[PDB]
Structure formats: C-alpha cells, structure tokens
Amino acid sequence: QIPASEQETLVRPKPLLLKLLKSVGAQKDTYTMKEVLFYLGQYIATKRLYDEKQQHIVYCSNDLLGDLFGVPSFSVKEHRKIYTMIYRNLVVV
Amino acid sequence: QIPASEQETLVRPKPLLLKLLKSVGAQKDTYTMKEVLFYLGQYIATKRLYDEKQQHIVYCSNDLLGDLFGVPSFSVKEHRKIYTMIYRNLVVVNQ
Amino acid sequence: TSFXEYWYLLL
Amino acid sequence: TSFXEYWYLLL
C-alpha cells in the first residue's frame, strides 16, 4: 500500500486529472492524496475499465485515463508505477 | 465498521445476491464477508447508482439490488441497516 | 466525500 | 479477487 504519510499530502490535480475526478462528482480543486485515490478507484469501477476475469488489469486505451497516464493498460498490482503515474498529474500545495 | 473477526466470516450468498455478485465478475459460491462487501461496493459504482452530489445516497428501485435488499433507496451511512439487509441474503457457513 | 470513502467506512 | 480489493490493497 501507499504509506499513510504519503496519502495525507495536500495536492492540486492538473487539468486532465481534475476533469477525470470531477466527471465522477469530485467537487474541489485541492485534495489529499488519499482522496485522489478514492475518486480514481471509483472512476475506474464506474467506467468498468477493469477486466472481468483478471480484475487487476485496467484497460484505458479508449478512455481519458489512458491519455492521462499515457499507457494502453496497467495492472493495479504495479503499485510503484501507479504512484508515479498519478504524481505526474499532481502538484503539491 | 465490520469487526476484524467478522471480516473473515465465511458466507454463502443466496440466489439473488449471488447473481448480483457474479454480474460484476465474482466466480464462486463461497465468500468472506469482506469479499461480499468488496463486490457489492464495486457493483454499485459500476451501475452508477450513487447520487453524484451526495454520494452516500444509493438509488435501487429499478435495480436487482432493490429487489434483494427490499428497499427503493438507502444511505451508505446506515451501517446497521445495510449489514442487516446483507445478512438476510446469505447463510453463514456452519450456523 | 466520495461513494468509495463512504463504502470504505462501511467495510 | 475483485477490482475493489486490488485497489483497496493499493490504498
């Protein structure tokens, strides 16, 4: 898991990520990293981007998320890569 | 707030609940309570049944979830009520 | 608060 | 394993 201390960081999502978060009802311009992770997980479930059989696989080549991360797909098991990909779309307050 | 002991309690979902779980990729007859809550949470998000503005509100009158819970809507804040509705739709193994 | 956090708090 | 558990294990 992402450490607790790394999730309490106050962050400002960049335009594209901000658009993504607000598309599932996120309200604000600033979030804790924890909140970003809540809404991003929610987003993926809501758009049904997870593979039905192997549900750690997220297919985003036809989604805003794929443009955001710049990959056709990724695995939720790749904790470091997701951390990195998320952080490219954030600025710390 | 399901206790740590209760999280790992093994359960067998009744037919309607099992149908719901399998509709979002669950593929067995026996689950822990934790797993049921995982898939159920996933289901609600996948079907977009939560109010976008106040996301504790779940609408389900025209959904399979409403049939098995027996309610037209509920709040995620109603922890006791949800547990009660979930336990009505499963049998605890060896009870 | 997201539906994901509310349900998380319910778990 | 559900996509909800995988992401939960990332959180």
Side-chain angles (χ1 to χ4, degrees), chain B residues 14-65:
Chain B
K14 293 177 180 173
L16 289 175
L17 181 54
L18 191 63
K19 186 182 174 175
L20 183 151
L21 299 175
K22 296 201 172 184
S23 78
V24 289
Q27 52 177 15
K28 51 187 186 288
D29 296 343
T30 308
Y31 301 86
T32 64
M33 280 297 296
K34 194 182 187 79
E35 290 173 321
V36 172
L37 272 292
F38 278 133
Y39 273 111
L40 187 56
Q42 184 166 304
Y43 177 89
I44 292 164
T46 298
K47 304 281 284 201
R48 304 181 211 243
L49 298 178
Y50 61 88
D51 189 282
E52 280 206 330
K53 179 69 181 176
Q54 299 293 337
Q55 309 209 345
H56 68 98
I57 300 165
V58 175
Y59 308 91
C60 49
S61 190
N62 193 227
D63 193 85
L64 178 59
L65 177 58

Side-chain angles (χ1 to χ4, degrees), chain A residues 2 56-58 69 71 73-86, chain D residues 6-7 10:
Chain A
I2 306 310
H56 66 95
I57 303 171
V58 178
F69 286 175
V71 298
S73 57
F74 66 94
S75 174
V76 177
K77 293 180 186 176
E78 300 176 288
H79 288 185
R80 192 189 173 191
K81 189 157 78 183
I82 295 163
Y83 178 88
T84 306
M85 288 187 304
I86 289 167
Chain D
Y6 282 120
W7 200 263
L10 173 73

Side-chain angles (χ1 to χ4, degrees), chain A residues 37-85:
Chain A
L37 289 153
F38 276 129
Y39 273 111
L40 187 58
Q42 180 167 308
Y43 177 84
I44 291 160
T46 298
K47 303 291 289 294
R48 217 184 216 286
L49 305 175
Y50 60 86
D51 184 71
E52 191 78 340
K53 305 284 185 164
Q54 298 164 227
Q55 305 216 342
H56 66 95
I57 303 171
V58 178
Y59 283 103
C60 42
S61 61
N62 201 30
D63 192 91
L64 175 61
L65 182 60
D67 303 337
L68 185 82
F69 286 175
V71 298
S73 57
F74 66 94
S75 174
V76 177
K77 293 180 186 176
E78 300 176 288
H79 288 185
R80 192 189 173 191
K81 189 157 78 183
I82 295 163
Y83 178 88
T84 306
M85 288 187 304

Side-chain angles (χ1 to χ4, degrees), chain B residues 9-12 30-31 90-95:
Chain B
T9 298
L10 204 67
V11 299
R12 292 192 177 104
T30 308
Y31 301 86
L90 54 82
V91 303
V92 177
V93 173
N94 300 336
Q95 180 171 338

Side-chain angles (χ1 to χ4, degrees), chain B residues 7 37 41 44 55 83, chain C residues 1-3 6-7 9-10:
Chain B
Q7 294 274 6
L37 272 292
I44 292 164
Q55 309 209 345
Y83 305 146
Chain C
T1 304
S2 65
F3 167 73
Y6 282 122
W7 201 263
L9 290 166
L10 173 75

